[PDB]
């Protein structure tokens, strides 16, 4: 039925057309924040945090981490059916979860913090990471198969003081799991030549803006560096969690990222939380050390504020942006599908677009003009060998919504 995007699927329309050939279907029906979606091998992992009252200043009511199957719901439309749910005892201590599928389970790596979000209280946070393993098909009377909690004791960080999962989902290679992650490096140990800051033709930029933008504020104690957290399951005895820093090609501040397999190769997306507002994604050259051949995309960006609005390419000192990933659905033409926010300085107007590096092939809005939106997570797969995509979109009971979009074969309705 539902399988991974691998092999050689049905044709997708490769021409650019204004025709309405994308038909999004809503498959989902007090605030709900911090969402997480992952789709792998016909299964899915989902997570959220339900708060009471406000979304930012509200009390944490319940943290949900579940897994299940992606099935044909009946009318040839894929949907998600929960099969195994888990809730921590204190919802306000679990942060920054990231789910990676392997064979029988989803392994979700989360951070444990009694000082709030480690991104906003980095220096105070004492690094504590947990692993919750959830079976995609639970079995009765089966011990720790269905749900298993593992407090991670051994972590190798290299030059970084602290490391944390930072992204919705990672990949598996053989028996080794890789989670999107970030490392906190003190600015005193941050060796960066300002010569590498691309200030050319930028009238009001300074070569210092890159290094200062590598932190949440210009005087931050840490800089954030994206990368991977590696967990080798073959080393069964006690598995060390190893940090792998991302290469410094087109370096931007550590931000929520995603590594996913598509057409049998790894692809990486990194959210643009700084001055480089054009979308950052591409095929992975090497996983260890992590280097990504970023696409030179000139059509997809993200909303910002005053300093770094959408389409900005000059280095400024800013920490602003949103996570809006994209899934590669055709490597031979490097075509991708994802939801972007169609606004320069406000997080709003979600639009699902199928696009190449230098052109948007075809798109469709997901809500009215004034509708506010935030993080979006898009994962694509095959249903009876037609490419489908499921997108989680935060939208303003403030709660996320899930859409299923089939990628059409022809360019006319």
């Amino acid at each position: 039925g539902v399988s991974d995007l691998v092999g050689l699927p049905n044709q997708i329309c490769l021409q650019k057309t204004t025709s309405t050939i994308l038909k999004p279907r809503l498959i989902s029906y007090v605030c709900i924040t911090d969402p997480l979606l992952a789709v792998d091998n016909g299964f899915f992992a989902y997570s959220h945090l339900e708060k009471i009252g406000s979304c930012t200043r509200g009390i944490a009511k319940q943290r949900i981490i579940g897994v299940g199957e992606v099935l044909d719901r009946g009318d040839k439309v894929p949907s998600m059916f929960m099969t195994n749910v888990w809730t921590p005892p204190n919802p306000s201590t679990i942060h920054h979860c990231s789910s990676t599928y392997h064979e029988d389970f989803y392994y979700t790596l989360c951070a444990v913090s009694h000082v709030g979000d480690p991104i906003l209280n980095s220096t105070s946070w004492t690094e504590s990471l947990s692993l919750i393993r959830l079976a995609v098909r639970p079995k009765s009377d089966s011990g720790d198969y269905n749900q298993k909690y593992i407090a991670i004791t051994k972590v190798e960080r290299g030059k970084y003081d602290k490391v944390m999962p930072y992204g919705p989902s990672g990949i598996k290679q053989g028996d080794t799991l890789y989670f999107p992650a970030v490392g906190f490096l003190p600015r005193t140990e941050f060796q960066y030549n300002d010569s590498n800051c691309p200030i050319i033709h930028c009238k009001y930029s300074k070569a210092e803006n890159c290094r200062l933008s590598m932190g949440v504020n210009s005087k931050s104690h840490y800089i954030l560096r994206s990368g991977l957290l590696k967990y080798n399951l073959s080393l069964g005895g006690d598995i060390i969690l190893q940090f792998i820093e991302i290469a410094d090609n087109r370096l931007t501040i550590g931000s929520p990222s995603k590594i996913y397999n598509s057409l049998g190769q790894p692809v990486f997306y990194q959210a643009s939380y700084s001055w480089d507002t054009m979308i950052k994604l591409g095929d992975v050259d090497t996983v260890d050390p992590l280097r990504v051949q970023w696409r030179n995309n000139s059509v997809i960006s993200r909303p910002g504020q005053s300093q770094c609005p959408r389409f900005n390419v000059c280095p400024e000192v800013c920490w602003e942006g949103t996570y809006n990933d994209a899934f590669l659905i055709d490597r031979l033409n490097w075509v991708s599908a994802g939801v972007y926010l169609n606004s320069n300085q406000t997080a709003e107007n979600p639009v699902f677009a199928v696009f190449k590096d230098n052109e948007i092939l075809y798109q469709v809005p997901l809500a009215e003009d004034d509708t506010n939106a935030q993080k979006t997570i898009t994962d694509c797969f095959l249903l009876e060998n037609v490419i489908w995509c499921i997108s989680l979109v935060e939208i303003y009971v403030i709660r996320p919504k899930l859409f299923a979009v089939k990628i059409p074969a022809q360019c006319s309705e």
Partner: antibody
Amino acid sequence: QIQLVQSGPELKKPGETVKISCTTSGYTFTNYGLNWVKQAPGKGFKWMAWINTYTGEPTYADDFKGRFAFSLETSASTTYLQINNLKNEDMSTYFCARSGYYDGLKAMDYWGQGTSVTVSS
Amino acid sequence: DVLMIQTPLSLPVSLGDQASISCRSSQSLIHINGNTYLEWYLQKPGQSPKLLIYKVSNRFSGVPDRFSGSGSGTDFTLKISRVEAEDLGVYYCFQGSHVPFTFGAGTKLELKR
């Protein structure tokens, strides 16, 4: 009335230092940056650097790090290219050209007349 | 490194003919801002170069309409419809999309006899 004028020809021995000037007139100096380009005799052009006349910060190619220095004086509306520890591979004709910021046209529309630098013992 | 390959290095043409110079890049010259900073310059003997064409196809001030530019991504062409004697010289393509900015080897437009 837009014109860029460079310093005269230079004849130097290996190891010495040369400083080529490029004085511009006829436009607002800070509204367009400058490009330094190098042409070897009977050969092609090599882009050396681009200087931001508003901030003073240059962006140079990797081959021209170290003994090359790209500075400017805003009062005189001049940019300077200084080469230290001259070697034979520096003998060439050096041009300055007007290259705009992203706010307009970054193409090299107005050029200097060029400055020849001969290096020999 | 981004490489600019010009064809041909020497282009003998009779006066009043059409000339075509091809420039191909090792990587796409479409910057991530949508612009393709491919420029064509001309240099006459004993003269500083002169900007002919900017952004693939736009003509700089004072350039005759007989000069035109076309292409996209990695393939570009400069075209002279009817070559007057004032066009004899050396034509260079140039890319300003990736640092370090690079030139072509050049094409010598000379007179056939």
